[model samples]
Target: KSEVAHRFKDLGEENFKALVLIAFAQYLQQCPFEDHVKLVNEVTEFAKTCVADESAENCDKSLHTLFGDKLCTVADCCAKQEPERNECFLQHKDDNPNLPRLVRPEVDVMCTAFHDNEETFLKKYLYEIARRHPYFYAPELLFFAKRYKAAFTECCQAADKAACLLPKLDELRDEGKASSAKQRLKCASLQKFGERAFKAWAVARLSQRFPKAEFAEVSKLVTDLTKVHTECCHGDLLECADDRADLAKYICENQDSISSKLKECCEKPLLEKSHCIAEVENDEMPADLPSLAADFVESKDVCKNYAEAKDVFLGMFLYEYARRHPDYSVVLLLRLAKTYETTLEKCCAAADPHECYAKVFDEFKPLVEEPQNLIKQNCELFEQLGEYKFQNALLVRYTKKVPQVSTPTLVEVSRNLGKVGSKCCKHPEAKRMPCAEDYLSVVLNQLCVLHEKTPVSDRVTKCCTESLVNRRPCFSALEVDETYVPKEFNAETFFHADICTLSEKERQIKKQTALVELVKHKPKATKEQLKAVMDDFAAFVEKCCKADDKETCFAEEGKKLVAASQAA
Candidate 1:
């Protein structure tokens, strides 16, 4: 203060004196400069010396220190006396300017120098504020002791880590809310709340949660957990965002750590005993089926162009390979399967295997002998069935595999389920899910039914026991979800539907649906705008939306028709 005053004296005694009075007037509510014109001149004179580097705050402080007292003598203006100073300032209409020049903040008014330390400074300012005023932030000071104040948080520790955290006495608190319910609920878990506050929150929370509990299990679980967490959240537990209710909720769910003792403890869904057991991760094994996945990848492309042939080959070859090697990628399986495709060219085109060289796998040859008997093991009886009848039976029976077919006897069906047990229940001959299990169930069920209608002697054959339900083959032949039914189907139709007409309408529907997607996925478009839809849209139908593998085909090529029109 003296150094600053010495510098002021050198600058100009008259100016310094006036600066003090002028600035002092500013502190009195309205800067009533009415009686103090000479003072104002001097105040402005010295104020000019305050270069840019001089803070308005420091200048205000110096002027305040020198002439802060007793500036107002007018009865109407707030008086200069300590008590009356504030009162007259409030009521002062006596030449009162709307804005006061400046006033020092009480926080700064309390101290001249500060220690590098916080606690020392806290007490000093706190003490000064308390000296003149009764509640001079007294409540704030209590909050400070609890480390509850928001800023300058370093002094928060009423300064001990553990002992400072001794639980707050509930009876001592005011009913006045200290924090929001959300804040109170979440606040304690923060490291900012400290252990003692956390404990207070915890104790009250548990009592509240289990208030009326008669726990053979539940309340005991809470008690058990509290013991375990007694020391938790001393600083922070992953910045706990939990509420007392959250803890209570946890207690109700299964917490195996606490579950044994509190067998009644909480049950977290993800941790239920059986569920957890079911999902156990095998550290050493990959989840995908190795051979099956590989097979899918290898045949995925081939199936797109010739899905039926793929299934037939897959089944025939898989069954043959599994017999010879017990396990094989059986690419050789392809050759054998391809042979059937090659041989059945004319007949397989009939949309009914009954029309093809379908006597049996062994019966298909370079020669000409076509028999529709599916269970040739009962050759005499089976041979008696008509082609369309056998095909119809197979269709109905296949659907029933997933739906119903009187249960079986053929070794592959018990001469019928008695059938699938004999093998994978997949046709070693047919080509490819309700997609697999649904497919398997339906496929095998029908195949089994196919057997039940056969003769007794031939019902159980070498092929019956040995023929496996090769997925690709069975899947192709299966009709669980109707997924594998060729765009062109053979089995009997209802309402006397015309096969040729039905197929063409189906094609139009497929293309139209794909066109709908293009409409949805692209900007507004119409058939007139898209050249492909300009006429019969034969061009678009040729490229996309025209195969049994419709989805895969459309995903890539489907929208081109509409897409091209938009570009145009």
Candidate 2:
């Protein structure tokens, strides 16, 4: 839910209560006017649960019981279905005027209790961690639990327990200080990138992380989370912590209504809860979801939405595109959104606004499709070949492209690149592409560092040293070593009729990989020459697969193409 709850949770109770107060103030700004009084009364009743157990189940059941019926009546206040409906309720978090702020737990009291009943003290410690970190992903909070328990166990064994423990206790507080520092860095990114891009990133990130949740719910969550950063990023720390903690509550409680898997994740008690939630599998992106391109082109608010609320307008577009094209990388989705936004801004000045808006998709198709197709091909190889073979293929392609590089450097680069694929490639569809982008950049960055000490080639050096932002593209433009030529071009070894038995997409990926193999082996072959070879190869496969003389067709035709090219 935020960059706050996980930090404030370990800071102790009074700080957390102040966070809740700040969060409630933000909620009051957006909540329905008529229900404000009733929400306050109900939340006042619900806050008592926090005094007792304050666990996710207790807080959720208490909240559900108090406001469950009242919430139904307020349905008309927002969108009929998810996200809007869920968001409106979350905004009403702290309507209760009489709700008490949490009192700080005494260290002496807790220590005495820990010495008297070690088991009870740990149980209490787990609850305190859980309650304060309502938004903390269960697994992540469990990580916090381990740290706390270890500190207590070590401290209790010392002769001067308080002296030994106080420093260790300060370690947890130090963690909060570090976390808040990271939060500011995130806020810096938000300011630099702009709110529209930040929300777009969130949509891509959250959609992938929680694929089982509806896209609408995911979008709403992004909207809520972003709103907190926008309002609190530059303001009071209390407000930031409070708002994030409130979001954590909404995120945890809403799981029960929206996602069965996440709900089960929420149900497990302190110890195993985190692991269960962490292991929840991402569901496939639904194929039939509405497309943003379609929706935007048909939209009447193209100008109004941008002029009035540009962030939401583009956030909706990116979320729609992301859910539909879950297979697309986050970078691609951001690129698509950027293209659409720039075109829309340009078209706002056009004589025919509708016509201009309609053509944005048309213009973007050719610009994006080449890389989009390449991504699909890469995914196919990564999934089908698995980790080890995929790494070998990547190494083979790298050598073929820049054969002038020393074999030692080439081998080192190949191993690191393979490590990237192993770490990133197998994630669920929504996550894999973004994961690939981040880790692959590290590997490429390492190569650039090496290029400083010992240059590879003029092209490689230029790309590595100077092409910092667009290194991927610069590197891609590099060609095979021109002076090197293969000793043989063996089409017989290349052609295979068995590929015809695979699915259409798999067949295409295989064909593309084979094309690379052919070009690498025949470095002197021009584009036109390779196209001719590929066309013949495709035709031969088609001709041989259904024939009575299949083997004869492959052997003779493949040999003929190889011989004809050689003779030329």
What RMSD does each model have against the real structure? 36.5, 21.4
**Candidate 1 deviant stretches above 4 angstroms:** 1-434, 441-464, 471-568
lDDT measured at residue 7 in model 2 versus the true structure, 0 to 100: 32
Candidate 1 Cα lDDT to native: 0.32
Cα lDDT, all candidates: 0.32, 0.56
Error of 2 at 214 (Å): 7.6
Quote the positional error of residue 92 for candidate 2 in Å.
41
Give model 2's TM-score versus the native structure. 0.43
Give all TM-scores, in the order shown: 0.14, 0.43
Cα lDDT tens digits for candidate 1, 150-243: 2234223345422332222221121112211112222223223344333333332332223222223333443444433332222111111122
Provide the clashing-pair count of each candidate structure: 36, 3
Scanning candidate 2 in windows of ten residues, the lowest lDDT window is 130-139
C-alpha-based local distance difference test score of model 2: 0.56
Q: For residues 123-217, what per-residue lDDT tens digits would candidate 2 score against the true structure?
A: 44444432332222222333454667777777767787778778776776545333333343344445445776567767875665566566678
